[PDB]
Design a protein around this motif. Sequence first.
Motif, PDB file in Angstrom:
ATOM      1  N   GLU A 162       0.821  -1.205   0.000  1.00  0.00           N
ATOM      2  CA  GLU A 162       0.000   0.000   0.000  1.00  0.00           C
ATOM      3  C   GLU A 162       0.857   1.257   0.000  1.00  0.00           C
ATOM      4  N   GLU A 163       2.023   1.211   0.646  1.00  0.00           N
ATOM      5  CA  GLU A 163       2.935   2.349   0.599  1.00  0.00           C
ATOM      6  C   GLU A 163       3.412   2.610  -0.823  1.00  0.00           C
ATOM      7  N   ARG A 164       3.730   1.539  -1.537  1.00  0.00           N
ATOM      8  CA  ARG A 164       4.162   1.658  -2.917  1.00  0.00           C
ATOM      9  C   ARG A 164       3.033   2.260  -3.744  1.00  0.00           C
ATOM     10  N   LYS A 165       1.823   1.744  -3.556  1.00  0.00           N
ATOM     11  CA  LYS A 165       0.664   2.227  -4.297  1.00  0.00           C
ATOM     12  C   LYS A 165       0.447   3.717  -4.065  1.00  0.00           C
ATOM     13  N   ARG A 166       0.548   4.129  -2.806  1.00  0.00           N
ATOM     14  CA  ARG A 166       0.373   5.528  -2.446  1.00  0.00           C
ATOM     15  C   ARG A 166       1.441   6.391  -3.102  1.00  0.00           C
ATOM     16  N   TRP A 167       2.685   5.934  -3.046  1.00  0.00           N
ATOM     17  CA  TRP A 167       3.787   6.682  -3.644  1.00  0.00           C
ATOM     18  C   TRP A 167       3.563   6.873  -5.139  1.00  0.00           C
ATOM     19  N   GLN A 168       3.206   5.789  -5.834  1.00  0.00           N
ATOM     20  CA  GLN A 168       2.949   5.878  -7.267  1.00  0.00           C
ATOM     21  C   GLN A 168       1.784   6.812  -7.564  1.00  0.00           C
ATOM     22  N   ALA A 169       0.715   6.733  -6.768  1.00  0.00           N
ATOM     23  CA  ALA A 169      -0.441   7.595  -6.993  1.00  0.00           C
ATOM     24  C   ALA A 169      -0.090   9.060  -6.771  1.00  0.00           C
ATOM     25  N   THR A 170       0.697   9.352  -5.734  1.00  0.00           N
ATOM     26  CA  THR A 170       1.093  10.731  -5.468  1.00  0.00           C
ATOM     27  C   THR A 170       1.968  11.272  -6.591  1.00  0.00           C
ATOM     28  N   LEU A 171       2.925  10.465  -7.058  1.00  0.00           N
ATOM     29  CA  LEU A 171       3.769  10.896  -8.167  1.00  0.00           C
ATOM     30  C   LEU A 171       2.943  11.143  -9.422  1.00  0.00           C
ATOM     31  N   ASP A 172       1.999  10.245  -9.715  1.00  0.00           N
ATOM     32  CA  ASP A 172       1.164  10.404 -10.900  1.00  0.00           C
ATOM     33  C   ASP A 172       0.316  11.665 -10.807  1.00  0.00           C
ATOM     34  N   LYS A 186      -0.754  17.235 -12.450  1.00  0.00           N
ATOM     35  CA  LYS A 186      -1.076  18.611 -12.088  1.00  0.00           C
ATOM     36  C   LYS A 186      -0.017  19.640 -12.466  1.00  0.00           C
ATOM     37  N   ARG A 187       1.215  19.192 -12.670  1.00  0.00           N
ATOM     38  CA  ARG A 187       2.295  20.114 -13.007  1.00  0.00           C
ATOM     39  C   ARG A 187       2.811  19.970 -14.430  1.00  0.00           C
ATOM     40  N   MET A 188       3.240  18.777 -14.835  1.00  0.00           N
ATOM     41  CA  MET A 188       3.797  18.559 -16.161  1.00  0.00           C
ATOM     42  C   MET A 188       2.739  18.233 -17.204  1.00  0.00           C
ATOM     43  N   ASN A 189       1.468  18.142 -16.808  1.00  0.00           N
ATOM     44  CA  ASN A 189       0.358  17.838 -17.711  1.00  0.00           C
ATOM     45  C   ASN A 189       0.592  16.503 -18.428  1.00  0.00           C
ATOM     46  N   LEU A 190       0.648  15.449 -17.616  1.00  0.00           N
ATOM     47  CA  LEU A 190       0.882  14.093 -18.099  1.00  0.00           C
ATOM     48  C   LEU A 190      -0.114  13.154 -17.438  1.00  0.00           C
ATOM     49  N   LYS A 191      -0.899  12.453 -18.253  1.00  0.00           N
ATOM     50  CA  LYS A 191      -1.865  11.507 -17.722  1.00  0.00           C
ATOM     51  C   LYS A 191      -1.165  10.226 -17.269  1.00  0.00           C
ATOM     52  N   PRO A 192      -1.711   9.544 -16.265  1.00  0.00           N
ATOM     53  CA  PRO A 192      -1.138   8.255 -15.861  1.00  0.00           C
ATOM     54  C   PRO A 192      -1.325   7.211 -16.949  1.00  0.00           C
ATOM     55  N   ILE A 193      -0.241   6.496 -17.253  1.00  0.00           N
ATOM     56  CA  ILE A 193      -0.241   5.477 -18.292  1.00  0.00           C
ATOM     57  C   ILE A 193       0.200   4.151 -17.690  1.00  0.00           C
ATOM     58  N   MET A 194      -0.253   3.064 -18.315  1.00  0.00           N
ATOM     59  CA  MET A 194       0.081   1.727 -17.837  1.00  0.00           C
ATOM     60  C   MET A 194       1.508   1.346 -18.218  1.00  0.00           C
ATOM     61  N   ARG A 195       1.802   1.323 -19.515  1.00  0.00           N
ATOM     62  CA  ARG A 195       3.124   0.983 -20.020  1.00  0.00           C
ATOM     63  C   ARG A 195       3.819   2.247 -20.507  1.00  0.00           C
ATOM     64  N   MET A 196       5.137   2.301 -20.316  1.00  0.00           N
ATOM     65  CA  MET A 196       5.910   3.485 -20.673  1.00  0.00           C
ATOM     66  C   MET A 196       5.788   3.795 -22.160  1.00  0.00           C
ATOM     67  N   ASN A 197       5.463   5.049 -22.465  1.00  0.00           N
ATOM     68  CA  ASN A 197       5.237   5.483 -23.834  1.00  0.00           C
ATOM     69  C   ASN A 197       6.548   6.008 -24.419  1.00  0.00           C
ATOM     70  N   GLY A 198       6.473   6.627 -25.593  1.00  0.00           N
ATOM     71  CA  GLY A 198       7.634   7.240 -26.201  1.00  0.00           C
ATOM     72  C   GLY A 198       7.630   8.743 -26.032  1.00  0.00           C
ATOM     73  N   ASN A 199       6.472   9.370 -26.256  1.00  0.00           N
ATOM     74  CA  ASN A 199       6.357  10.809 -26.042  1.00  0.00           C
ATOM     75  C   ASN A 199       6.365  11.141 -24.556  1.00  0.00           C
ATOM     76  N   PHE A 200       5.730  10.295 -23.742  1.00  0.00           N
ATOM     77  CA  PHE A 200       5.810  10.454 -22.295  1.00  0.00           C
ATOM     78  C   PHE A 200       7.254  10.366 -21.823  1.00  0.00           C
ATOM     79  N   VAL A 229      12.419  17.307 -12.924  1.00  0.00           N
ATOM     80  CA  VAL A 229      13.130  17.148 -11.659  1.00  0.00           C
ATOM     81  C   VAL A 229      12.736  18.253 -10.688  1.00  0.00           C
ATOM     82  N   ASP A 230      12.560  19.475 -11.195  1.00  0.00           N
ATOM     83  CA  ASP A 230      12.143  20.580 -10.338  1.00  0.00           C
ATOM     84  C   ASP A 230      10.785  20.300  -9.707  1.00  0.00           C
ATOM     85  N   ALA A 231       9.851  19.766 -10.496  1.00  0.00           N
ATOM     86  CA  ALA A 231       8.525  19.460  -9.973  1.00  0.00           C
ATOM     87  C   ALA A 231       8.569  18.294  -8.993  1.00  0.00           C
ATOM     88  N   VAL A 232       9.426  17.307  -9.254  1.00  0.00           N
ATOM     89  CA  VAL A 232       9.502  16.143  -8.375  1.00  0.00           C
ATOM     90  C   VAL A 232      10.147  16.505  -7.041  1.00  0.00           C
TER      91      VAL A 232
END
Lengths: 510, 155, 77
Positions: free
Chosen positions: B17-27, B32-46, B56-59
């Motif tokens: 659950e900690e991992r899940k929370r961390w991933q959800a917070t990062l997403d 909200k900042r970089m305007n990137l939707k959560p995706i399942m598999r890593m994209n190319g433009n993402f 890095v500044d936002a993270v």
Amino acid sequence: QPLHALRNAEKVLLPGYHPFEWQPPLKNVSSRTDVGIIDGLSGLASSVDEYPVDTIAKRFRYDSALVSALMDMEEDILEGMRSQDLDDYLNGPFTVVVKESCDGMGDVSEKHGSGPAVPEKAVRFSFTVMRITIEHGSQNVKVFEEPKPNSELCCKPLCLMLADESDHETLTAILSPLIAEREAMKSSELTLEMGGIPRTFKFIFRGTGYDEKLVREVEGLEASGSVYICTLCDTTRLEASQNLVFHSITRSHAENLQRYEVWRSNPYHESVEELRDRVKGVSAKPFIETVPSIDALHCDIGNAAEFYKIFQLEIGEVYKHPNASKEERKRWQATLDKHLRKRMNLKPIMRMNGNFARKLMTQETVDAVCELIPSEERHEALRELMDLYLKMKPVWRSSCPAKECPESLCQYSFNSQRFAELLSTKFKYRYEGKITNYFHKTLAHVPEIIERDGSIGAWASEGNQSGNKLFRRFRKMNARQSKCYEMEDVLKHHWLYTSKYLQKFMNAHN
Amino acid sequence: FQLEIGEVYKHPNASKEERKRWQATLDKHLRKRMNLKPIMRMNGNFARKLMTQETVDAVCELIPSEERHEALRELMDLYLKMKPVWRSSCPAKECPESLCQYSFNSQRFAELLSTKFKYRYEGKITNYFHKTLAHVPEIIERDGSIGAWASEGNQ
Amino acid sequence: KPLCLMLADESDHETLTAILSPLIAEREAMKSSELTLEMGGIPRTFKFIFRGTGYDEKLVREVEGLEASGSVYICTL
DNA sequence: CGGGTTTTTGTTAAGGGCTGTATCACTGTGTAAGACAGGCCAGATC
DNA sequence: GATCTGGCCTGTCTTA
DNA sequence: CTGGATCTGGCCTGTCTTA
DNA sequence: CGGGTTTTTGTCTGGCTTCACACTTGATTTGCATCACTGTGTAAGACAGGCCAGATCCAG
DNA sequence: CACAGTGATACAGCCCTTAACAAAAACCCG
DNA sequence: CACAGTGATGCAAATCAAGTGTGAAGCCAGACAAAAACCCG
Ligand SMILES: [Ca+2]
Ligand SMILES: [Zn+2]
């Protein structure tokens, strides 16, 4: 011509261009005649201090859309007037009837970038004219009627929003202005210029392109798994599996409103089950007026699925072996699928669709299935069952059963009674105390439906699904790839595509 | 990033659950900042948009530590200094400084991973990190250009 | 430019080899020859040097005779 | 080779109108199984 | 008869 | 005063119905 | 309900263009019918039934 | 440093109208 | 009783070509009829 010439010519076809005025000014509706594509939220506040909003919407204004459609069909109306031996300068009250439809869509991927948290779904709403009739002399005479009622070239879109069909709050918040406009229009006349003569128009709104799920969700009814199974009569699942042929249409909008009133107020002060019995399973306030009808596409789909089930049960001889594990049923299904691939060239699918349904209903399909069953009399039973079904289907599947199949129409009661008797006698092992929705809808109500309207297949929701396909195509290849402008582009392009003034230039072969 | 938000270098153990929370917070932050939707598999433009200094500044607004910030800044800086060497169609005529300094940058990158990233890269490594840090200069001096021979055209 | 279209599983080794055997055969055959043809009314001469690089790591492991990526010999170079 | 005379072009003192191109923020094609190291119970056993 | 072994599982990591 | 027969409450779990 | 005064036209008149109009047959080019398939139908809710748990009751 | 789109918007470019002059390309005569 | 496609194929129908002499629908010089639409009488 260059692109700007096209842009400039688009203005004539899009709504909000021609002046019009109703006799008695619509209520709660503006008089601005230059209103085209507007915001769909209808001024819904997006402040953080209120209910969260996460959807976007674009739509026309309904009266402006109808005026644009009439301007588009003007030539067809005039040709119909000329072909029926009438005078073109007649300005009598034209009677127009339309067809409404609405369906939700899934797997509509969200885009990157700024904007609200849009869900991965979509809901569409459209309308379609059916026929126009002037009152000449004493009787009536029809001027124009759609030859292809289930075509994608006549399904004019009205509202487009990326929401969920199950989200009742957002759905009502988006659809309430359209329903208000419809109700206000239902009691007014339209003065409109055709060829330089002010014409009078009146409308009759009929909504039939709805699946049973949306009807149950909107009409203030329960789900499909409830005990009240029909949306036309008040019978329950038990009684519906014992009579099968003697029922009458009772449900209506005003009755549903009265029922919900009785449910909320609880005048007689009775228990929850007694109050449910008194209300006949109504627990929500309806907000869209629909007529009691039956969708032919989903009816055929459900009938084919249930037949499929009956076939894969007959392969296993369940009428003698009531006990069976899961592996046995899986083997039966796999054997049926392999036999269909071998003899019917059909690919086994998961979700039932239309083409599979059309190809499954055939006598030689029943022969190929009986090639799997050892018994003899069950072959006769299945063959007579399929014969009855195929003799009954053209009644509700055709566009005019009064002229395309009068023999099957006048003999529809006997066929339905024999069908019910065959279900009760031979197939008792499955239809003893329970039956599906469509079976009841087909065996009980459709003769009254034809005698009340004249056709069922014409009032289906086929054009809605074709419009869903066109929407999937346009959102991907005919729109700006951005949340802020994709919906307006798709709506405008679909409105242009559905127009008839442009389709006449393509029929330059006569 | 996920592991740095949760301070794995401070708490080696963690539930799911900690991992899940961390991933959800990062997403949520990235959306909200970089305007990137959560995706399942890593994209190319993402992937292209994710590899920026701004990201890095936002993270770093989620990591309470201060040295971690510097570590991630230098990590992203070295990676962005090494990217054009294997991404350009002609590094000998479009980025000669990055080509000549690729070895030094790769060595500093490896030293950074070995020193300040032990919690993940101790005794194990992926395929592409090895391929990038070990075999890029030789392929460049042999063929002349990486990226022009990519499998993107088939895709 | 396309050269071959098939409906088969990428992981299916037998069918993949059975379909791709003629192409590899012709490739290895003409990797030791020269082509001549008349363009613009003048016969020319051509020599080929083929380079297979548009392969992801999984297909490289499959065709080159290695194992899955989760092994210890990680690099194909 | 020149005066005298002719033809066919330049020409900005400023506006109207059609046509072509840059700009903006995004999109779709990279998408299923195998390797392996640790943990744990049935079991041959000295 | 407790004692390590064998083998079987299983969650994680690696490419898609 | 107390151990013990035992009679529903609800709970979770498939199954059927529309999509 | 009809008098003046220009428009709006078909000719009279016969004599000059530029296209129109009989035949082939062997190609050559368009136009149209035919055939086996396609997509859009695509997530939850209602209800019965077995199962313990714990409350409900019995008797020394 | 993937790249071909994707529709509306804006601006530059190039055409078009009053101006008399004024510079470039050629025969009749000497 | 979904329907507009999706491509190839195969057959039926239109045409063109070269051959050439006639035949026919225009326009045109004025002109003074024949309506004929404005004015109002
Ligand atoms: Ca739907
Ligand atoms: Zn009913």
